[model samples]
Target: YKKEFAAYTAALAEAESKKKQDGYLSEPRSQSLNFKSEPNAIRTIDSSVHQYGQQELDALVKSWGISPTNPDRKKSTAYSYFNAINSNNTYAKLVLEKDKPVDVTYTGLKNSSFNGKKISKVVYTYTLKETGFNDGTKMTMFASSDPTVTAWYNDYFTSTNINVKVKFYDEEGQLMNLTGGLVNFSSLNRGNGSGAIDKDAIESVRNFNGRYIPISGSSIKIHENNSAYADSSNAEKSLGARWNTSEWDTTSSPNNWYGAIVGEITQSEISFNMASSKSGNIWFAFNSNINAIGVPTKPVA
Candidate 1:
């Protein structure tokens, strides 16, 4: 009565294999990446992303003649970044040049929804504007105090063992450790669509006004910091800190405190930077009773 599949287990295995699909919900993807970028092309609107309001982004999109229903369907040499997962709400608008256009990356909620549903009760946008180029160095600095936000960056990095602690330069200008911890979804106030890793969501949460100088990642005694961010401070600490400082920095040169130390910091900004406060293999978290966030300490295991 039965052929080679006389065994019940073998019959079930054959049937199950036939029903397998590319995906149960969405298309198959590579977890190799922590966050997802648009399928279009990997173009960042300069590290210094602007916190544009939804109204501003929507206006810009409209100016570009992007329609309400599916304005993103049109492709222009002047612009070419569209996240149509929901509405044409978020995309890139560019001012064409021989190469690279002045572009605005619309991030966050569009009309307060994404893909199709409302993701953020309140949302913001991001943009890249060219001031034509400043031969004179001027930096815009900013930081995010949201642990939920930093948690996203942690998952982004550590998913592949890129477990560098996400620290920040405090308002006081001293380097302070971030409340480094693993990913916690409940607090990950990114957008309602968690697993999606929407472009707007990443921009909305992690986008601050400053560029992150690589703070930590490798080491000798494993002090848990980078040669770059440290060197930036090391080369010039008039404050007598071990790290260096830039030649441009001076007592009168607009000194800004930075880091968890809660110091004053001037927004002047970049060059050679990184972030992974822990040297490697170990981590230790400080007390919540302490400050904005208790620092962590642990050795690379």
Candidate 2:
């Protein structure tokens, strides 16, 4: 049995040696490694951005049919997006050029409730100029005393009316509906007494026309140095004492008496009646010194 086992082991060794020699010859066999005839080319990209000019803007606005024939600022929906830009911006100027001026109706003034304060309302309405310039666009009125009148300074022996016209404008220049409070006339000087007006003068208790009416207050403002009176302060004091109560005596005050001349706006007209003995000019100008309201303050761009 031992001799048979030895012969079988020798046969197994010979078989493994023959398989190793065969395995090496199989590895040397030929194989194909494929390749293209031409080298790979990277994709080329060509790109550009168009810069917009005035001509393009004009053409685009024209395409929207924004012209004199159809001069509606809000004719196109895109117009609002352009018009919303700052009016001073150069781009906005070009875009809004095609936009038509809004039709604003000056309906005159009257005693009315505007923006919570009692004002001689700038009664006006809006014809929508642009599509997106909706009713929500804030519109407001601004007003001041007319500069041309000098009658407030002259003396009056009989009760007289100082009548002047006031003008208002929208700062945004959109011609939208305007609210009050933008024009404050509560600070105008009335007499040559003190720069400050008497608080009770404008108080709602005493009703002549309303608070804004200039001479509606209990007392009339007079100047101290006017030749019409023998002694300015004494005359003013005696007259105020005779006209109403003792409250109007402002002779001790060195500055001018203050009242609302411009604030006395009715039907867009500033008119007030001063007592016969009253002297001194109610001076206030609608210039750069004040709020700078009205048409001049509108955006130029």
Candidate 3:
């Protein structure tokens, strides 16, 4: 949730040093930091406020080796998006708007017995708070050919009234924003032989199990007819596995993750076709759509 991550935190401070920001404040204003005089409605003194502006957003977009053709459609601010090198995925979050407020309340186990609520296992789902528009372009990067597994992705963003960008950061922190001829790629889990992948519009991926890799020389197949690759994170998967990470874009520190964040764009007609893909511990990770961040399943116990 929040880590005051050095890179992103530093960047936030740098942006706040500027002006004209805020979709809304993070938390309620505190009282004054007076000597012992209670406090003067606090006037928003030194709180761990993590804010963002055009400058900060621009820097983040650029960091992924992307450029915006149009000026920001509008000024906006929220928790962090992606902290460079920071992986604190689950963190507490709080958001406050003028008349409307959105948040989560974690209560104990649901009451489900004659006596009352009984403790037991759990389950869940994910949805995004969508803001719609019909202006912008779509960019697709089929990635390139590599000795090992490579990646293919499609990004459709509209910058009509919001600033949305797409980018890719490889292991070396290198950026890839376009599609072209095959390129060099190596995988921790290398394989060969192609198989049919499940042809679902979208998937709720979990674990890769024994399908970590394919024949060393083969490009493992994850067909549109996608197959049995032990996509069981903690549970067996018949149609698809489940995602683990849940809390996204909380109204708190370094909060770029959002439980309700959504991404949808317009297109004349686009089709993504690929072959020779292997598996890794990251079975559910590599998806053709960049917006496919499904919340993983939670433990039964």
What lDDT does each candidate get? 0.22, 0.24, 0.21
The most accurate candidate by lDDT is 2
Q: lDDT score of model 1?
A: 0.22
Better of 1 and 2 by lDDT: 2
Say which prediction, candidate 1 or candidate 3, comes out ahead on lDDT.
1
lDDT of 1 at 201: 19
Output candidate 1 Cα RMSD.
22.9
Model 2 agreement with the true structure over 140-234: per-residue lDDT tens digits? 11111222111121111111122223333333322222211222222232233321221111111111121232222212232332101112122
Q: Sort by TM-score, best first.
A: 2, 1, 3
TM-score of every prediction relative to native: 0.20, 0.22, 0.16
Instruction: Tell me the TM-score of model 3.
Output: 0.16
Predicted candidate 1 versus true structure: per-residue lDDT over 15-39, tens digit per residue: 3443232111011111110111123
Which stretch of 10 consecutive residues in model 1 shows the poorest summed lDDT? Answer: 24-33
Off by over 4 Å in 3: 1-138, 157-301
| Candidate 1 runs further than 4 Å off | 1-51, 69-167, 170-172, 176-301
Q: Count clashing residue pairs per candidate.
A: 57, 15, 36
